[PDB]
Structure formats: C-alpha cells, structure tokens
C-alpha cells in the first residue's frame, strides 16, 4: 500500500508529495523498488513499524512505477490492484510491476520558482509550466514582453510548456496566461524571482569522454588479458590524435580478481595493473595534455575477501566490523558448513555450492562475494568520503559512482558536500535520475537517454516523433543539469552498439546524434575504429581486448569519430546552445543548438532512401552539420 501522507515545497521540484509505502511485514529486511531507483535494493531501506514494514519517501508528482523486495526476492504490492508490465530495454527491465499515481488533488496549471521551474544556464533562463495532460491548448509567459510558450512534452498525467528568456537579469516579474480547450481563459499566479541554477567544474561542458577498462586496453611494451596503467601511457599519442580530452577510468584499486568491482582495498592500485606509482605517472602525463581523469568508486559494497568483513567472519559479533555492513543473522557463514566448502578444493566450483547454500548478511543480488555495506552507520559514509578525498587530492578529477542508485541518496548528498569545487561526480543510475541530481550528483550516466536511443537508433521500434518526446521529457525532468549527464551510446554493462544496428552506416548516424546533443558524449573505448564484441564460451562480450593492428581498424569510422570530437569541442552551439526541435517524423529528424545568437543545425536521415528537407536532399543513413560557413555531411 502506497498513500500520498502529505506535500512540502521544494527549492528543486517546486513542490514534492511526502509518500508513504507499507506491507505486511513477514522477513528478515525489505526494500522499496522503483522507476526512481531502477529497482534496486539498497537506497530505500524500509523497516518495521509494527506488524509491516514501512517508508516514507518524498516523490515528485508523477506516476511511479514500484515494487518490493523481500528478503532479496521481487514481490508485488499486495493491497495495489493496480498492476502493468514496465519495459526499459535501457537495463533490460521487463516484468510486471505497481503504479502509484501520485499527484495533488488541485492540480490543473502549476509552476513555482525552484530549480527544475524557473533557472539559468550559460546566461539563458528556462521557464516552465506543468499542466493537466491534455487540458490546456496554449499558455503565454507574462512577463517583462509576452512571450508564447510551447508544448515540449507529454508524461502519463503532464503535458510540459517551456519557454525560453534573456538571463542577462535577476529578480524577474511574472505570471501565466492559460488557455483551455474549451476556451476557458485565465491568469495564473504573480511571480517575482530570480532564477535559481546549479554549480558545475566548468572544465565538464567541453569534454569528450572516453571509457576505459585498463585489462583490456593496452599491455605494456616494459616487461615487469593483461592490459595495465603502463599500456594506458604508453598509448597516450592515439587518445591525442582521436581529440578526447577526459578519461573514464574502470576500478584500479587492489580487488581479489582482474574483474575489479571486488575491492580489497581502497587506498592502493591494484599490483597487476602495475601498482601505485603507474597511476602516478599516468596522471601526471595525462595532466600535459590537459586530459582529466575520472575513477570507478565501489562504495554499494566490497570484496567477501576485504579485511574488514573477513574480520567479521571469524569475530562475528565482539568484531568492530559487524555494524560495517548488513548482518542478518549473526552466525555469519554457517557453522563450519561454508568454510568447509570454502577449505574442501573444488576450484571455484565450490561458488554454486556455498550460493545454494544461502549466507546471513546482504550483497548484491546474489552474489555472495559482494556484501553490501551499511549506509545508515556514519562510519562508512566517512569511510566513503574518506576513499574519495584520498584519490581526488591525488589529482583525481573525479568519481563515476558504481551501482549509485543502490545507494542512498543521502550518501551522496554528504559526498557532493564534501568534495571540492572542480571535482566531477556522477553515478550509476539506470533511471529516472531526478533523486539523484542537483545538490548530489553533476549528472549520472544517462541510461534513460540511451533507452529513447535503443528504441529508436538501435530497434527502431519508435518515430522521430516519440522519440522527441522522450528526449523533451528527459529536458523537464532534468532542466540544467540535462547538460552535466555523462551520455553514451555504449559501455563496459551494455552490447557495443555497432553490434546492436550491425550496419556500420546506422552507427554513424547514432553517433552523430550522440556527438551534437545536450550533456557530455563518451565512447567505449575500441568504439573509434569500429571494434565488435567478442565470443566468450557462447557468450558475446563487448569487453573485447583492444586492437592495435591498425590493419584491423574500421578507418572511415576513425576517421568520423576525428571529425565529431574536433566539431564538437569547438562549436559554442553543440557546448551550451539550446536544443529545438526543427523537425521530427518518422525516420528523419532536424534540429538546432543556438547559443549567443550562434546556430548549429543537425539533420539525420535513418532511412533507406533518399529524403528532400531544409532544400536540400539529405542522402540515405547520413547526418548533415550546418552552421556558420560550413555544410558537412557525416556518411559512412
């Protein structure tokens, strides 16, 4: 059961309903699950009342998608009827799942100064108006000139108006008028505000990100798959002349395998990847060519094998451990029943037989070689902090937080407060990020953008149209800090994209698209000459070791990949512009970045044929950059 308990104003979402969610309670622990934490356990913790478990959680109005999990096990609402199979093909979601409708009883127009309703971003002031789907046909912002406002997008119970205003101001004076579909006509508020926006290392909005999983990337020619931080240095020359100015590292820290998301250590870089002094040098090299660097954190969890719970395995309770993470029953691994399948050989194998045996503490999922800490005790979260501040001193640029939406938000709003100034933190969010942006996170990788991507570029199960939609949701729901998200067309958790549309000629287009749109673009690395996932015993891996036999590389890709970065990190438009829509329907889509009277237009055509737009005729799977003294075609 899910009850809307109250509302309280909100300085980001204007308005915010305080939610509660319940259940009869019947196990050991329980987790709210949602579209506001990709469902996942960890961030929401419910705990026992009395004879339920309950929570309280403040939701933006909206409709929610949710569930729950029981002892780690997905379990539906009992008391809401309201059911529905949620997809997002952006994490591989697709079950069945509650709804909860969450939306103040008055509503019919509304707007109130705050973040997402009223801000400024590269000396432009968006203003928005939400209102009851379908019911309003027009609105105009009233304020020092009447401006009309237009209808950007369309949620389950939202249809969005914006607008966009001179920010060369401060303290700006308004109100709304709103038209009706029958025609009813009326004023909406009387405004005075200045308008509010966010904080940002400013070296963020002219990067060119690009990932990189040490293992796979380059071995080193020093004799001392194995790729290392000496390989990484050793191929800095082929990241200068790709244009990439910043790094996404994957977990460098001491960890039990070559894997890295089992950290043994947090405070040391991992011996096969060359060990401390390696990452010291690397950085420093990297710092001459102003390349920054971004660091893979693991703080949802650490390795079965870290000091600090291995001390809780042969201690149990009298270990100052125990409350490090989440213990369920005390005799922690079962009475010699798991050390000895742990002690009896079996190489490995012996993995299956302790997993069917069952463990007494929290992980992730059902790995139970990846306990999850607890981060309710201020001694982690000083823990965690600490880890950060240790690296970023270093001259770490930044953090890519690992499973962030398993963790509380809280967590996060603690590191975004204690961390300096110029440091960049995302996370891992698979979707909507909105509890997680703002005065937490800068941005968090874009998984919501990448679904309205696979629909579209990928499947093709989408119009230009709907696709716009999404895109223009995502622009409501994430206002400024649209322009702070980490996007991405692949990565190290998903299929390289060439291998999802096959056609070399349809990637071209999807980065394209990636290359010219609001928020950061990165690629995996391999991704600038055309590299494919690989076989690995019927399973095909996208982490494909790097190959540097240049007589392998795709260099039409190279060469485009070259062009968009270099296109990219020079025109002010693609950097801070504004994003409208010129045209969007069925395959093809126009659209303009504007920025200082400067104009970058960006039309793609995703059809087989031939298409006549903007005078012109726009070749089969093409992209074309237009903007000040210059027409580009962007073709395989």
């Given at each position: 059961m899910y009850k809307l308990v109250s509302f309280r104003d909100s300085e980001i979402f204007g308005r915010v309903a305080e939610v509660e969610f319940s259940l009869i309670r019947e196990g050991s622990y329980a987790y709210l699950l949602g579209d506001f934490n990709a469902f996942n356990e960890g961030s929401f913790r419910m705990e026992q009342e009395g004879k339920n478990w309950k929570i309280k959680i403040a939701l933006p109005e909206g409709v929610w998608h949710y569930a729950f999990s029981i002892d780690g096990k997905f379990v539906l609402d009992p008391d809401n009827p309201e059911r529905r199979v949620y997809t997002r093909k952006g994490y591989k979601f697709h079950r069945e799942v509650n709804v909860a409708r969450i939306v103040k009883s008055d509503d019919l127009v509304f707007h109130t100064p705050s973040l997402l309703y009223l801000y400024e971003i590269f000396g432009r002031v968006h203003v928005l108006l939400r209102t009851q789907k379908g019911v309003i046909k027009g609105a105009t912002f009233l304020g020092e000139k009447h401006v009309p406002m237009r209808k950007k997008a369309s949620d389950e119970l939202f249809d969005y108006f914006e607008v966009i205003v001179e920010g060369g101001d401060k303290r700006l004076n308004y109100s709304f008028e709103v038209l009706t579909m029958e025609g009813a006509k009326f004023e909406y508020g009387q405004f005075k505000a200045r308008p509010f926006s966010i904080e940002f290392p400013?070296?963020?909005?002219?990067r060119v990100f690009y990932q990189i999983m040490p293992d796979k990337f380059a071995r080193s020619r020093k004799i001392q798959w194995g790729g290392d931080l000496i390989g990484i240095k050793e191929k800095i020359d082929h990241l200068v002349n790709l244009g990439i100015n910043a790094i996404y590292l994957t977990p460098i820290f001491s960890?039990?395998?070559?894997?890295?998301?089992?950290?043994?250590?947090?405070?040391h870089v991992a011996r096969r990847l060359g060990g401390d002094r390696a990452f010291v040098d690397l950085l420093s090299e990297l710092k001459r060519f102003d390349i920054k660097v971004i660091l893979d954190g693991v703080f949802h969890h650490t390795s079965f094998f870290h000091p600090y719970f291995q001390d809780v395995v042969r201690k149990?309770?009298?270990?100052?451990?125990?409350?490090?993470y989440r213990i369920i029953k005390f005799p922690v691994v079962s009475k010699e029943f798991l050390q000895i399948l742990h002690s009896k050989s079996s190489w490995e194998e012996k993995y299956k037989k302790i997993k069917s045996l069952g463990w007494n503490y929290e992980s992730?999922?059902?790995?139970?070689i990846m306990p999850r800490l607890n981060h309710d005790n201020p001694k982690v979260r000083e823990f965690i902090k600490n880890v950060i501040l240790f690296w970023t001193n270093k001259g770490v640029d930044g953090f890519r937080m690992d499973v962030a939406h398993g963790v509380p938000p809280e967590v996060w709003k603690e590191v975004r407060e204690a961390l300096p100034k110029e440091k960049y933190l995302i996370g891992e969010v698979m979707d909507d990020a909105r509890l997680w942006l703002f005065d937490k996170f800068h941005g968090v990788m874009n998984y919501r953008l990448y679904d309205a991507i696979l629909r579209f570029f990928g499947y093709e199960e989408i119009t230009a149209e709907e696709f716009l939609n999404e895109l223009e949701l995502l622009s409501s729901y994430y206002g400024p800090a649209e322009y702070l998200m980490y996007n991405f067309?692949?990565?190290?958790?998903?299929?390289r994209f060439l291998d999802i549309v096959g056609d070399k000629r349809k990637y071209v287009c999807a980065l394209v698209f990636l290359m010219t749109y609001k928020g950061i673009p990165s690629l995996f690395y391999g991704d600038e000459i055309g590299l494919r996932g690989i076989n690995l015993q019927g399973m095909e891996s996208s982490r494909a070791p790097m190959l540097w036999n240049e007589e392998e590389w795709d260099q039409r890709i190279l060469e485009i990949t070259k062009t968009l970065v270099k296109i990219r990190k020079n025109n002010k438009a693609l950097l801070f512009g504004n994003f409208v829509p010129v045209k969007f329907k069925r395959k093809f889509m126009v659209y303009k970045r504007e920025h200082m009277g400067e104009r970058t237009i960006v039309a793609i055509n995703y059809s087989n044929s031939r298409v006549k737009e903007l005078g012109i005729t726009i070749p089969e799977y093409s992209g074309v950059i237009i903007n000040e003294d210059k027409v580009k075609l962007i073709k395989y």
């Open positions: 400013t070296w963020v909005i002219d960890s039990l395998t070559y894997h890295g998301y089992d950290i043994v250590d947090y405070f149990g309770e009298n270990s100052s451990f125990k409350n490090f992730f999922f059902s790995v139970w067309l692949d990565n190290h958790d998903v299929e």
